[PDB]
Amino acid sequence: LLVNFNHIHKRIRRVADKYLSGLVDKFPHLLWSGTVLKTMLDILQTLSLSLSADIHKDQPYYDIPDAPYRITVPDTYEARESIVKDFAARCGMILQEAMKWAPTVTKSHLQEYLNKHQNWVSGLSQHTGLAMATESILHFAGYNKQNTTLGA
Amino acid sequence: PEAIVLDIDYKSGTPMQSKAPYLAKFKVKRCGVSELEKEGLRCKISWQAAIFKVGDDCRQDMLALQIIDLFKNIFQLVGLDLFVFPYRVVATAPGCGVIECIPDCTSRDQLGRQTDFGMYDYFTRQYGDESTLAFQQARYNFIR
């Protein structure tokens, strides 16, 4: 359902979004899973890389690493920017939803994700996935043991 | 002058309306220029179509095609993307000339007579909806 969220048509993505919302509503425990986050970061990085890839050049297809699928992109720059900006909000929404309930497990998963050799070489470039991961950790953090029970 | 004729098709003769011109088909091989020059003193295969015209001048077209070739060379050197097809033609006798034919000739007038509609409908029927990739590539080539 996540990989079908960015279809080229109009109603397909809407119905996919509705199905995803229903599925995540009836099964809350999928938020803190250890595979959904990696897949969504990978597809976000793929879209960010495809943002500027010489639109006139052919072959708009792309391959998602570690998962057999493909993604098609529109022709104009404006449509691509619009779709990537639209997708860049669900990531934050579900990240804050997951961090609200069980911060420990999702924090540990995020720490584990940032320890791969392949991404370290390209970290000197944009690598939007790592930036998202290191930016979403702070403003959903909480108090520690010492400052958990006090009155302002 | 950069090809060696191999044979002639004995069933492709078709005179056109007009002055008695006709159309001819040959099976030819492409070798080059210097190699052809050296091989002509001792004795990648395609087909070509030639049109023989009698009683008409063929000199302005040479200027037009020379200018077209020069423009194509300039555009190719600069690094842009412009498409032009400089078909060749040579006049040999007063009022007599030989004209090359572009492969897969398709006159606009014949298509208009067959369809009696705009070319947009023809393209939509040929390739499909505007949302496909083939339509986009055809549009890009047409703009070029």
Neighbouring residues of A148: CB distance < 8 A, sequence distance ≥ 6: none
Contact status, residue A140 vs residue A95, Cβ threshold 8 Å? yes
For the CA atoms of chain B, what is the radius of gyration? 19
Neighbouring residues of A70: CB distance < 8 A, sequence distance ≥ 6: A61, A62, A63, A64
Residue B141 at interface with chain A, using a CB cutoff of 8 Å:
no
Q: What interhelical angle do B119-127 and B133-143 show, nearest 10?
A: 140
Residue A11 at interface with chain B, using a CB cutoff of 8 Å:
no
A114's tokens? 């940032």
SS3 of residue B45 by DSSP: strand
Label the pairing between strands B45-54 and B89-93: unpaired
Q: How far is B62 from chain A (nearest CA, A)?
A: 35
Nearest-angstrom CA–CA distance, B112 and B122? 10
B104's tokens? 């897969």
Contact status, residue A116 vs residue A130, Cβ threshold 8 Å? no
For residue A98, count other CB atoms closer than 10 A to its CB: 24
Q: Which of A18, A28, A22, A42 is nearest to A91 (CA)?
A: A42
Residues linked to residue B48 through DSSP beta bridges, in sequence order: B26
Q: How far is B101 from chain A (nearest CA, A)?
A: 31
Nearest-angstrom CA–CA distance, A114 and B14? 74
Q: Which of B143, B134, B136 is nearest to B82 (CA)?
A: B143
Nearest-angstrom CA–CA distance, A42 and A27? 23
Nearest-angstrom CA–CA distance, A94 and A137? 13
Helix extents (H) in B12-143: 34-39, 60-78, 108-115, 119-127, 133-143
Nearest-angstrom CA–CA distance, A7 and B106? 38
Report which secondary-structure segment, H or E, holds B54.
strand B45-54
Sheet holding B96-100, edge to edge: B3-8, B22-30, B45-54, B96-100, B89-93
Contact status, residue A43 vs residue A84, Cβ threshold 8 Å? no
* ∠ Cα A56 A73 A31 (to 5°): 150
